[PDB]
C-alpha cells in the first residue's frame, strides 16, 4: 500500500498522542553529556572520548577499571578474560591513552575511503595519460615487482603481529589504536599488490602473481634477516605491549622507514616512477599517523606514568635493546640490494646520509624518549658494514 501497514509512534496520530501525553514537561536531568564523568584530555571532552572511553568492562583490579568483581566466565585453568598478566608494563590507569588524531570508526573509514576513491581516479588518469612510457623497464620488472612486492610480506607480517593485541589490549582507547595500526599495515600490503596488479594491466608481459616476490621473501637473501625479525615479532612475542612497541618504535621505525622512505621513495623517482611513490605517500602518511599514537601510549602514558615511569622505561629500554639487534641485522641484509642496481644509481655517500636520517629520526622520535642511549655512528657503521 501507499501508506504501508506498520504504524509508527512518531507519525501515527493515535500512538503519537499517547506518547506525547506521557512525556514530562522538561528533561528529568539537565546533564545531557554522555561520558561527562570522563577526564578530558583537551579543553573539552571530544566525541572520540565520549564514544570510546570505558566501553571495556574492566573491574578496578585492572588499573583504571570502574567495574567490580571477577569475570563471569574464564579460560579452562582460570586465566581471566583480560588481566594484568598479559603484559609486563604497569600503569595507574589503562584508559589514559588518547589517539592524537582522535579516531573512532567513523573518521577512520571516512579517511581511508577518500584515499581509496582518489586512488582509483589517479590510476584512471595515470593510464589514460600514458605516464608509464617514461618508466625505467628494469626498475619495473625487477625492483618494483620482485623487491617492492616482496616487502608486502614484511608489512603483512607486521599486520598479523597485532592479532594478539586486538584480543589482549587492556583498554578501549588502546584497542582501537592498535586495531587501526594493524589495519593500516594490511592496507599497505594490499596496495603493494594493487600496484603490481595495475602494472599487469598496462604492461603486456607483467605477471601480477605473487610467486616471484614471495620466493624472494621466503627463500631470498635481501630480506632474509628482515623476515626472521618479522616471524619473531609476530609469533614469538606473547606480550601485546612488547609486540606493538617493538614493531612500531623499533623495527618498522628503522628498517621499514629505510626501505620505504630511503630506498624506493628516494630511488624510484630517478627511474621515472611516480607510480610507486603515490602508494608510498600513503604508507608514509599512515606511518606518521600511527606514530603519534604509539608515542602517546608508550611515552606520554606509560613511559611517563606518575607511578611506573622508571619501571616501564626500563622494560622498554630492554625491549628496544632486545629488538634493535634483529633490526640492524635486517638492515644489513637489505643493503645487499644496492649491488643489483644499475651503475651510477647511487653512491655510498648518499646511503650513509639516508641511514643517518632514519637513525637520527629514530633517536629523536623514539630512543631518546625512554632514555635509551643509542650510538648513531655505531649503528650506521654496523648496518653500513653490509654493502
Partner 1 sequence: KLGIHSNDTRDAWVNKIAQLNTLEKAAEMLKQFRMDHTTPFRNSYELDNDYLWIEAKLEEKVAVLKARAFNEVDFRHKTAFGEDAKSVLDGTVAKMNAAKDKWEAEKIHIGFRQAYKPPIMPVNYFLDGERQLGTRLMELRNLNYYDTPLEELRKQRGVRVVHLQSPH
Partner 2 sequence: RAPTSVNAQEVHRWLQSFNWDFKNNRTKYATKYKMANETKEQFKLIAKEYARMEAVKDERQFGSLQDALTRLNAGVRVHPKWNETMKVVSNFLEVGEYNAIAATGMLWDSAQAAEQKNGYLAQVLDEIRHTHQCAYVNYYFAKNGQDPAGHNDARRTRTIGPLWKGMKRVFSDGFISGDAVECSLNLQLVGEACFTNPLIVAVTEWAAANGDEITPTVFLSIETDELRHMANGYQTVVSIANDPASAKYLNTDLNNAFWTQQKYFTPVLGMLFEYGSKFKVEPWVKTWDRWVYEDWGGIWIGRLGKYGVESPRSLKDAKQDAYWAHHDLYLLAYALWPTGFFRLALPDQEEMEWFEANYPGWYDHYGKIYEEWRARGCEDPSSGFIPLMWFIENNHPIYIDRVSQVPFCPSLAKGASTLRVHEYNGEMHTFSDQWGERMWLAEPERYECQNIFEQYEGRELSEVIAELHGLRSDGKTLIAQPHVRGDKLWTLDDIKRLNCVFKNPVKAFN
Partner 3 sequence: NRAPTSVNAQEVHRWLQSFNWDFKNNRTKYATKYKMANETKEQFKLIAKEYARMEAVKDERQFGSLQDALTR
Give contact residues for partner 1 (rule: CB under 8 A). 59-63, 68-70, 75-79, 84-88, 90, 236-239, 242, 308, 310-311, 314-315, 318, 321-322
* Residues 166-195 interacting with partner 2 (rule: CB under 8 A): 166-169, 172, 175-176, 179, 183-184, 186-187, 189-191, 193-194
| Interaction of residue 19 with partner 3, rule CB under 8 A | no
Among candidates 215, 293, 223, which has minimal Cα distance to 258? Answer: 223
Euclidean distance between CA atoms 273 and 271, whole angstroms: 5
| Interaction of residue 163 with partner 2, rule CB under 8 A | yes
Chosen from partner 1, partner 3, Ca ion, none, partner binding at 90 (C-beta under 5 to 8 Å by type): partner 1
Extract the C-alpha cell encoding 15: 500512538
Nearer to Ca ion, 44 or 133 (CB): 133
- Shortest distance (Å) from residue 373 CB to Ca ion: 10
- Shortest distance (Å) from residue 308 CB to partner 3: 25
Under 8 Å between Cβ of 226 and 255: yes
Under 8 Å between Cβ of 138 and 342: yes
- Shortest distance (Å) from residue 119 CB to its own copies: 9
237 to 266: interface string for partner 3, x by CB under 8 A: -x----------------------------
Nearer to partner 1, 88 or 361 (CB): 88
* Residues 113-142 interacting with partner 2 (rule: CB under 8 A): 113, 115-117, 119-120, 123-125, 127-130
| Interaction of residue 210 with partner 3, rule CB under 8 A | yes
Under 8 Å between Cβ of 37 and 95: no
| Contacting range for partner 3; rule: CB under 8 A; set: 26-34, 101-109, 248-256, 294-302 | 101-109
Extract the C-alpha cell encoding 385: 658494514
| Interaction of residue 42 with partner 2, rule CB under 8 A | no
In the numeric block, the cell 634483529 is attached to 326
Q: Would you mind telling me the total number of residues written for the chain in this entry?
A: 387
How many secondary structure helices (H) and strands (E) does the chain include? Answer: 16, 0
CA 135 to chain centre: 30
DSSP string, 333-355: HHHTTGGGSPTTS--HHHHHHHH
Extract the C-alpha cell encoding 58: 574492566
* Residues 284-323 interacting with its own copies (rule: CB under 8 A): 284-289, 291
Euclidean distance between CA atoms 297 and 303, whole angstroms: 8
Euclidean distance between CA atoms 226 and 251, whole angstroms: 9
Cβ partners under 8 Å of residue 123, min gap 6:
198
Residues that bind partner 3 (CB under 8 A): 75-77, 105-106, 108-110, 112-113, 115-117, 119-120, 123-125, 127-130, 152-153, 156, 164, 183-184, 186-187, 189-191, 193-194, 197-198, 201-202, 208-211, 214, 217-218, 231, 235-236, 238, 288, 361
Amino acid at each position: 500500500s501507499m501508506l504501508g501497514e506498520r504504524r509508527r509512534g512518531l507519525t501515527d496520530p493515535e500512538m503519537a498522542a499517547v506518547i506525547l501525553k506521557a512525556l514530562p514537561e522538561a528533561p528529568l536531568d539537565g546533564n545531557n553529556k554522555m561520558g561527562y564523568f570522563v577526564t578530558p584530555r583537551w579543553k573539552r571532552l571530544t566525541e572520540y572520548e565520549a564514544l570510546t572511553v570505558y566501553a571495556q568492562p574492566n573491574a578496578d583490579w585492572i588499573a583504571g577499571g570502574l567495574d567490580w568483581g571477577d569475570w563471569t566466565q574464564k579460560f579452562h585453568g582460570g586465566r581471566p578474560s583480560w588481566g594484568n598478566e598479559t603484559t609486563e608494563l604497569r600503569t595507574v590507569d589503562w584508559f589514559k591513552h588518547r589517539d592524537p588524531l582522535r579516531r573512532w570508526h567513523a573518521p577512520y573509514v571516512k579517511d581511508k575511503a577518500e584515499e581509496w576513491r582518489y586512488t582509483d581516479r589517479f590510476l584512471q588518469g595515470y593510464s589514460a595519460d600514458g605516464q608509464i612510457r617514461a618508466m625505467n623497464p628494469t626498475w619495473r620488472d625487477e625492483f618494483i615487482n620482485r623487491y617492492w612486492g616482496a616487502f608486502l610480506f614484511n608489512e603483512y607480517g607486521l599486520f598479523n603481529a597485532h592479532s594478539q593485541g586486538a584480543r589482549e589490549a587492556l583498554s578501549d582507547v588502546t584497542r582501537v589504536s592498535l586495531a587501526f595500526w594493524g589495519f593500516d599495515k594490511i592496507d599497505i600490503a594490499q596496495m603493494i599488490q594493487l600496484e603490481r596488479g595495475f602494472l599487469a594491466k598496462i604492461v603486456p608481459g607483467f605477471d601480477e602473481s605473487t610467486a616471484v616476490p614471495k620466493a624472494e621473501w621466503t627463500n631470498g637473501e635481501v630480506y632474509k634477516s628482515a623476515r626472521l625479525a618479522v616471524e619473531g615479532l609476530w609469533q614469538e612475542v606473547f606480550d601485546w605491549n612488547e609486540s606493538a612497541f617493538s614493531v612500531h618504535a623499533v623495527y618498522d621505525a628503522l628498517f621499514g622507514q629505510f626501505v620505504r622512505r630511503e630506498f624506493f621513495q628516494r630511488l624510484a623517482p630517478r627511474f621515472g616512477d611516480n607510480l610507486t611513490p603515490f602508494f608510498i605517500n600513503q604508507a608514509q602518511t599512515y606511518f606518521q599517523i600511527a606514530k603519534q599514537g604509539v608515542q602517546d601510549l608508550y611515552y606520554n602514558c606509560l613511559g611517563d606514568d606518575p607511578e611506573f615511569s622508571d619501571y616501564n622505561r626500563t622494560v622498554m629500554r630492554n625491549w628496544t635493546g632486545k629488538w634493535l639487534e634483529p633490526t640492524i641485522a635486517a638492515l644489513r641484509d637489505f643493503m645487499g640490494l644496492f649491488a643489483k642496481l644499475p651503475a651510477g644509481t647511487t653512491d655510498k655517500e648518499e646511503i650513509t646520509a639516508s641511514l643517518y636520517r632514519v637513525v637520527d629520526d629514530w633517536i629523536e622520535d623514539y630512543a631518546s624518549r625512554i632514555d635509551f642511549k643509542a650510538d648513531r655512528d655505531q649503528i650506521v657503521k654496523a648496518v653500513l658494514a653490509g654493502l
